[PDB]
Amino acid sequence: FMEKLKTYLELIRVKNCITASIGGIIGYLISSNFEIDILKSLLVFFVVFFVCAYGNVINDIFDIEIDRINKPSRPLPSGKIKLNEAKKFSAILLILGLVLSLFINIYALIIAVINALFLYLYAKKYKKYKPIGNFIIGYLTGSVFLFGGVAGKNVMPVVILFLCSLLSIWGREIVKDFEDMEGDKKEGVISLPIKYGKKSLYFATFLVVLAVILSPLPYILKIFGIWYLILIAICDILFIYAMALLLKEPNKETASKVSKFLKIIMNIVLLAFIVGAIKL
């Protein structure tokens, strides 16, 4: 049972879940202004943990045949865990997450249910269909924060963080798809750069631009101060510059570089929200 527990932790991808759970705490810290309550923290950490665990397991169930070719070392294609054992496990992880979220509030259950439907549908069909998949990737990453946010007293700064993450991650996903265009085409993957070419990069720019318009709101609404405003300013200008370069040079090389830059900037924006939250 020492080896079996290691196999079940490999199936859920325990590192990815803890990463998502920390994201959920981050959101709760901002919302409560670091005035953290241990009982609410334990609910937030584990609801995100089990909803994330369910998603990773449901992903492996629908990918058992695909994984048999690419990376057969995974728990399901290697035969370490039976398909039925995985299906019963994902059901248990799901009930745990949903029942636990009832003890937070109505908003937490709504996010829990919406995440659960998106995770199942993404694993089932929207992983291959990027126009909807790119939205899902954006929404789910942002929802992690919003989940911790709805548990705290001031959700407004976490609402802006969720909206900005969704828009910028969705945009960056189309940018990644423009770089992976040649590979995706010879795999039966439908994406905006495959259907529209360079035109899609204007929609990726639009999503980044809309995120930039919403970014000074915690300052304007008198929630966050000067350090947020300065960190956001550098990042907003760098975002508009990054997309401007890609629109001027719409190639695989530039798309690859802009994709790396946007990930760094997104991490500084997260730091700016944490820094802004330190109001004590």
Ligand SMILES: CCCCCCCC/C=C/CCCCCCCCOC(=O)[C@H](O)CO
């Ligand atoms: C990351 C790069 C950006 C550069 C950082 C810019 C931040 C500037 C912040 C200004 C506020 C000053 C806080 C320091 C108070 C310490 C002296 C207070 O005196 C003391 O040490 C007392 O004994 C404490 O009780």
Ligand SMILES: CCCCCCCC/C=C\CCCCCCCCOC(=O)[C@H](O)CO
């Ligand atoms: C591989 C080393 C890991 C050891 C973990 C350290 C434990 C420290 C804290 C308490 C353990 C959790 C509570 C016990 C749950 C089930 C006990 C019921 O007992 C058992 O699980 C059976 O005795 C197993 O045969």
Ligand SMILES: CCCCCCCC/C=C\CCCCCCCCOC(=O)[C@H](O)CO
């Ligand atoms: C590859 C992506 C990495 C970029 C991320 C930028 C982080 C933005 C946050 C603020 C940095 C604080 C400024 C202090 C550095 C000194 C300026 C020295 O800098 C300058 O004046 C010239 O830029 C030097 O060439």
Ligand code: DMA
């Ligand atoms: C960030 C994101 C899009 C979450 C979906 O989880 P997944 O099951 O697709 O993730 P992974 O491929 O890491 O198992």
Ligand code: DMA
């Ligand atoms: C404001 C903002 C975009 C938040 C941070 O996102 P992240 O660090 O989770 O981004 P990713 O992991 O998708 O690069």
Ligand SMILES: [Mg+2]
């Ligand atoms: Mg991502």
